[PDB]
């Protein structure tokens, strides 16, 4: 959805 | 004003 | 995205 | 570590 | 500093 | 940010 | 005007 | 001086 | 197993 | 993993 | 062991 | 971290 | 087996 | 001294 | 450190 | 025989 | 981590 | 020891 | 099977 | 052994 | 007969 | 799977 | 079989 | 007369 | 491992 | 006549 | 296969 | 057939 500082999935 | 129908999914 | 049957042992 | 999805017969 | 629109330092 | 890294984005 | 991640005057 | 009448948005 | 950081084993 | 007759990890 | 249709030792 | 920056030690 | 002898159909 | 992250002074 | 004359303001 | 620490697995 | 003499991982 | 079949120690 | 015998000082 | 490797020890 | 170790007949 | 219609004796 | 001082067959 | 293994007789 | 005796001072 | 001190260990 | 009136004695 | 007039030891 949303990495500020990341995002998995 | 972004992007709107930005389904992240 | 990980969207199957997963072990992570 | 054997594991993972098998399908078996 | 994430701007959407725009930002300044 | 000062003596830091940082991303802010 | 001292900032340490921004002045702005 | 950040000096300004101006608008935003 | 899964380590995350670290595995030892 | 000591298998005295088979292991399979 | 017997595998009939197939043994795993 | 797994998915964070680290500096330690 | 371990220490002993065996036959494998 | 020993300031782990930071020392200022 | 910093120390002696200084002012930050 | 053995006689030693001997860790098996 | 910051390990003193010896580190591990 | 004396083992008929098979001596480990 | 990380570390069986060993001596840290 | 009749049919069967047998030891004498 | 089927016989996993002997068959006489 | 397995053979059928073996006739054993 | 096993014998001694002695066996037979 | 018969002996599977050892006929003295 | 570590030795001191150092003024961080 | 196995006559003996024997140690076997 | 040792089939025929086999006297074994 | 065996001849049995014997001394064993």
Redesign the interface.
């Known amino acids: 959805?949303?990495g500020?500082?990341?995002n998995?999935?």
């Open positions: 959805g949303f500020g500082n990341d998995f999935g």
